[PDB]
Amino acid sequence: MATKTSIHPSVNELYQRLAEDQLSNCFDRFDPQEKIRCNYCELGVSCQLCSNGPCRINEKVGATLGVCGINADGMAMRYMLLRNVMGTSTYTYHAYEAYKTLKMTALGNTPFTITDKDKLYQMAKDLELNTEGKPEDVAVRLSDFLIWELYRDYDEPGKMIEVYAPLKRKEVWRKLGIYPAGPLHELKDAAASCLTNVDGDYVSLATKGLRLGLSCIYGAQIGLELVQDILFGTGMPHEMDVDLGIFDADYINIVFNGHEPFVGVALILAAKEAVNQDKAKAAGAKSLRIYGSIESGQEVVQRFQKDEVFRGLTGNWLTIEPMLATGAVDVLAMDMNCSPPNLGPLAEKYGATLVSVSRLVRFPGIHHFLDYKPSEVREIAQKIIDIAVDSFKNKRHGKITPKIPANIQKAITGFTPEAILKALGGSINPLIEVIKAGKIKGAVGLINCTTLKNGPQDYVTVNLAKELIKRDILILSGGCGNHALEVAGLCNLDAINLAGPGLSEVCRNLNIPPVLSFGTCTDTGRISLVVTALANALNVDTADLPVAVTAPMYMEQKATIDALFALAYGLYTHVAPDPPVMGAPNLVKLLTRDLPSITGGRIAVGSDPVKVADDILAHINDRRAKLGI
Amino acid sequence: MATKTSIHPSVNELYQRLAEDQLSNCFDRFDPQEKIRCNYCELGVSCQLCSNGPCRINEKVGATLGVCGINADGMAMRYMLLRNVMGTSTYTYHAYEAYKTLKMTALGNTPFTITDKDKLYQMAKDLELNTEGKPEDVAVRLSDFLIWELYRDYDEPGKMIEVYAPLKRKEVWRKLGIYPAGPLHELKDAAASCLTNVDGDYVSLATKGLRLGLSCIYGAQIGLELVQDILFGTGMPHEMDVDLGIFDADYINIVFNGHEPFVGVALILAAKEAVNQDKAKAAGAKSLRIYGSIESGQEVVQRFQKDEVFRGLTGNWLTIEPMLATGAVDVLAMDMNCSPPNLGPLAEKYGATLVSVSRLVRFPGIHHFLDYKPSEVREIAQKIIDIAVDSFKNKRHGKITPKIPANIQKAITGFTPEAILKALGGSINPLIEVIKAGKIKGAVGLINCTTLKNGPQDYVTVNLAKELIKRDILILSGGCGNHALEVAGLCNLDAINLAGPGLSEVCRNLNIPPVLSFGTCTDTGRISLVVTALANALNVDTADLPVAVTAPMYMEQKATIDALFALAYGLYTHVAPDPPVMGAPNLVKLLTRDLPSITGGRIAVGSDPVKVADDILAHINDRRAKLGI
Ligand code: SF4
Ligand code: SF4
Ligand code: SF3
Ligand code: SF3
Ligand code: FES
């Protein structure tokens, strides 16, 4: 058997159960699509945007342009821009909900509280907001200000970008005309540009993609993550359990899955109530447990300890179907992507109950719809617990055979800029010195999804990471790719043994792993805070630093909006598999060859871990040479 | 070469010039695309939204679902929703600019004024705004209120929908859960829903499309059109010259082209200054003239007279390339779609200068970029005039041979709800009387683009309109399909004699044409005002009225968002060519067969003018029978 599966043994074991049970699954669905792949679509040179189409670029038959007159470069970049409107929209949606959650929390309407009050007041001071009165007054003002940043138009100056972006970058952005409006206007402008017979200029469309990336980081991501820190605490390093062996079939098991952590936190709070533990015991369970899945799970493991109630992180999105095949899940509560749309029949077979907790998430076979509102989350969480108790009794316990793989790995989660500074003794200077001395050649932000396109689940990501650390490159990781490295064991102290001589020495001295878990793809803005701090300490631009970004198994456009940001931010940005652009030669030249003279960044490509790592190291060494280190 | 050109002789004559000059053009580019059309994309059963793709549904080879698990129905409806985010974004963009233009006008920083003060105060009263102070003060309050409608979230009640929608519709919408947020939030939510592994439920995606259509009409279109009336007057019927014979090569000819009329109005005002006419004459021209193209042109002909400076409307978007081939254009000033992206080589061959006046519009070979801001529009208009004088002197005069077809048609433009009531003597009741009597069987809103997919330019639109009026169906027209009917002579008093027995009789008595020019696709909201007036007068729901909508040569998603609106509004909605959904059998059943029991509306299909007209008339007659008429 030649099926492309996973690098993880636990997933491979569970794939065997899905196959034995004759259930459809991503791994098996890949090859039928392989058999009929469209080469025009693979290369970005098809278009379906209007009724004169569908169109294809084929010069042999005189189809050099679409009916409307657009060329291959415009066609490919326009569809890229459109798909990235979707990515920006998800981050904007999440930010808005975070800000309404903070406001409603301050008004007393949620089960949450103001946890990191120091961050609240420091952020309010940095943004020149009134800090008089009660903390709850300050939190309302901050929420309203951050909503204003979402809504601000292209002609109203932002404050977040001024506080959180370095001047040398801001100067480049002003020169290029890519200082963004708020993300709601920028995503509306980008979408309008993609309508037929509007923007057909690949350079303009690329520039609009860069603007869109900047609007997403400064106008949505940084604010939402800092607000989530205010609500739930700023992460510090701690030990977490990951992989699918964390499940135990004799407990009531509720799994929260998506990118927004509000329902998951409410569930943990509710499950800690004795009345709910007593319900679980009365139903025949040992107790009631909450688990995190994908990015909502990662948000929680960044800030919360493993305890008797919250048990850790299952894995990334290609683990969801396998997870159901454990026969251990009572409720899967889904808040955003990835919630794959054929989970219904798997939930039926394995005796799990599916609950959507967002109006965004719908697909056949969901059992309950409990759309999130801050003022209702207490009641939503309690309803989910009651559903899970009923499901355990009626569907699963003693009825479904559990087949839980034994694998559990330890990961140190919760790295944040604040945690890095604390490990270094309170300033970034020791890190600068070990980079100057060459103990650490540079650093990579691995900000990534997972996919099957360019290998078994997580194969490229894990092996690239191993090649990078062997070359004395420190990794800061976020996204599904971060979950991969955690499950693969690269985020614990044992992994120091796999790093090169300089990085192993630094890691042992600081007592940190060679891969630092920074959380989600939504934490790209937060990772930029570290890179900005490095540039400022060295008195250089971000494009001058010995760093790079990689999204080596990208899937959806949250990852590519983060890649567009990285390009605007001046960075060498590796992306695999190839985005659908390679049939557009002038667009390829722009992104891979000309952008260094425009933003300083560039796209890099490829899926061979050694070659990709060597190409990243060569970039890092070029930057080092120009710095004289 | 082209197998399909146009029903308009002027366009056919100019196509011959393009072909003899061997310049690329839409007519010729259709044929190569025809040769290689993808059957998957034609049917809506391909997907390019993530890296596990591209995917196709082909059950014969085992590809029943995408890699992610989505089915054909979800796949097709999701791409339809995404494309309609683009449509909604364009209307939202335009509305926001209209509101900022009214506010900046009230503050004294534009060359515009407050023309319809009655409408300003009536709107303010209906929306319960403060009406104290000067008219300018009220205009600022109205502008801010309508911006609030754009921004309103899914959880804050709107006022426009309460004022402008009829009673039973509002009950239906609340029951279905489709009462919308503001269009900015609805379009962001729709886009986020389309990301991989979010919403894969065709019924949910269709419902989201209905909500999005409602948000577009009540949250953007009605406000923007009424604000444009406040700025530039409420249209009343007047005779207008149309078709390409309106050009004269001896004048400096500036053509404005797009959907937003602000630059066009400022150009007309500037061209009336003697300093600019004197400049034109000193350059060797007889004087300086302004002309409207496509929807921006139509907005102006609705509200402005033909005079020595403003000369009328050229035609719809398939006329732009032919227009350049006249060799009579000095500047083509482009503000939105449709600005086809291969005009560059045509402008070069025929001695015209291309100017973009919107940050949305970019494509190769544009000469100048003058992005619109209300406070800069006076300067932008003057710069365009200066560019046009230099272009006439240095590119066109004495260098380019003009070839202007002789064809000029007369059309009565400027019908509005107000003009209809006026024509009836002040009340809608005389129109109800003739409908009840059976002289007018019903009314059709023809809200359409043009395309080459289902015939030569405008063939289906014009012949369908002729067949409808022959069946005693009054037409209210907006969009590129309105421009087609004007050019074909259906909008003047001679066209009365093309109508059937009852409609010709009524039109003769009222001295109106049988096709009433209501403007643009942006005027779908305004057409709903007429249909809502009929529903109220008859005290029946819109789904029970003897009306229908047709978009019979639709192209882009402004038209399909108007169709989704029509469906939500309860109407029989004919669309041709087929939208790309016909390979998704459950989605087809929903839209064509089940929606009558849900919203009251349904999609109808087909491109045969007689069959389409017969099917519309049958629906109208079914409605009539149930009303007792
Ligand atoms: S937008 Fe242009 S390239 Fe795309 S389908 Fe329409 S005519 Fe073809
Ligand atoms: S979203 Fe699903 S159907 Fe579309 S390309 Fe990705 S895997 Fe294929
Ligand atoms: Fe935030 S990273 Fe993109 S793939 Fe779906 S949850 Fe993963
Ligand atoms: Fe407003 S209708 Fe759609 S096609 Fe392009 S201008 Fe026409
Ligand atoms: S599947 Fe239609 S062009 Fe690729």
Author numbering:
A (entry chain B), B (entry chain A): 1 to 629
Article excerpt on this structure:
Here, we report on the structure and reactivity of such a deviant enzyme, termed CooS‐VCh. Its structure reveals the typical CODH scaffold, but contains an iron‐sulfur‐oxo hybrid‐cluster. Although closely related to true CODHs, CooS‐VCh catalyzes neither CO oxidation, nor CO2 reduction. The active site of CooS‐VCh undergoes a redox‐dependent restructuring between a reduced [4Fe‐3S]‐cluster and an oxidized [4Fe‐2S‐S*‐2O‐2(H2O)]‐cluster.
While the [2Fe‐2S] subsite with Fe2 and Fe3 coordinated by Cys338 and Cys480 hardly changes upon reduction, the two μ2‐oxo atoms and the water molecule disappeared, resulting in a [4Fe‐3S]‐cluster. The S3 atom, before part of a cysteine persulfide, is now embedded in the cluster after a shift of 3.1 Å, becoming a μ3‐ligand for Fe2, Fe3 and Fe4. Fe4, coordinated in the oxidized state by two oxo‐bridges, a sulfur and a water molecule, now relocates to an exo position by a 2.1 Å movement and is coordinated by His259, Glu295 and S3 and Sγ‐Cys521, for which Cys521 undergoes a 120° rotation to complete the tetrahedral coordination of Fe4. Fe1 loses its water ligand upon reduction and adopts a trigonal‐planar coordination with open coordination sites in the reduced state. When the hybrid‐cluster is reduced, it rearranges so that the persulfido sulfur becomes a μ3‐bridging ligand within the cluster. This switch of position for S3 and Sγ‐Cys521 opens the channel, providing access to the hybrid‐cluster cavity (open conformation in Figure 7B).
